[PDB]
């Protein structure tokens, strides 16, 4: 590991600096180094890890979608043959995206999830596992596509089961999990009705629990509730 010689605290400090500089690849490398120190991650550290990789993979996904659109148009009827280059470059970006997902899933499997006992850590990591299998599913086409989809579903489901037993309905991790599992249902599993039902039930159960919260917790929870509503508006 290229970060093996750097102190854990220095990796965390540099991850925060990289974030301020909008250097998300560096941020992710620093946080991978911090995970590989072998100690459990605090709440803030978990979110630094997720922010870094979400920004990296988000850029890869956006690029993949641009290239995939161009490739689809290059294969339509009447289009001029432009050679293998669009497919090759889409494949290059896809392979890099898959590599980032495999890296994140590898950190979760070695050994973040198995050491995560509290709901706030375990649900967070299982949500991440579902998210990164979902990103793999977005690009999957081979014999393993159904197994990739089911790996995402299985991780999200375990996270959901824990979250419903151990967290209040307004907990922002629980809300974000439900938001993302709902999107999985809509965009990956071809289950729009399940996506809409989950988003609506999550929103309504959170609404009923807002009265228990402080001002700052209310802001955290209502932010994610608005995303659930945004998706429901898009889908209905």
């Amino acid at each position: 590991g290229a970060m093996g010689s750097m102190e854990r605290a220095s990796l965390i400090q540099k991850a925060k600096l990289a974030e301020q500089a909008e250097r998300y690849e560096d941020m992710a490398a620093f946080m991978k180094g911090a995970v590989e120190k072998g100690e459990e991650l605090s709440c803030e550290e978990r979110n630094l890890l997720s922010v870094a990789y979400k920004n990296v993979v988000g850029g890869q996904r956006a690029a993949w979608r641009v290239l995939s659109s161009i490739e689809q148009k290059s294969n339509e009827e009447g289009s001029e043959e432009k050679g293998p280059e669009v497919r090759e470059y889409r494949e290059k970006v896809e392979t890099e995206l898959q590599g980032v997902c495999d890296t994140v899933l590898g950190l979760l499997d070695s050994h973040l999830i198995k050491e995560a006992g509290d709901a706030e850590s375990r649900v967070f990591y299982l949500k991440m596992k579902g998210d990164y299998y979902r990103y793999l599913a977005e690009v999957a086409t081979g014999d393993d596509k159904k197994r990739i989809i089911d790996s995402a579903r299985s991780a999200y489901q375990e996270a959901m089961d824990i979250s419903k037993k151990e967290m209040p309905p307004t907990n922002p991790i629980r809300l974000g999990l439900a938001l993302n599992f709902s999107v999985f249902h809509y965009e990956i599993a071809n289950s729009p009705e399940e996506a809409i039902s989950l988003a609506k039930t999550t929103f309504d159960e959170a609404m009923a629990d807002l009265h228990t919260l402080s001002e700052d917790s209310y802001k955290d929870s209502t932010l994610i509730m608005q995303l659930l509503r945004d998706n429901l508006t898009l889908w209905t």
């Binding site: 998210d131 974000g176 938001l179 993302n180 809509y186 965009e187 994610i224 995303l227 998706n231 889908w235």
Partner: peptide, 5 residues
């Protein structure tokens, strides 16, 4: 695209 976090 729909919102995720």
């Amino acid at each position: 695209f729909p919102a995720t976090v």
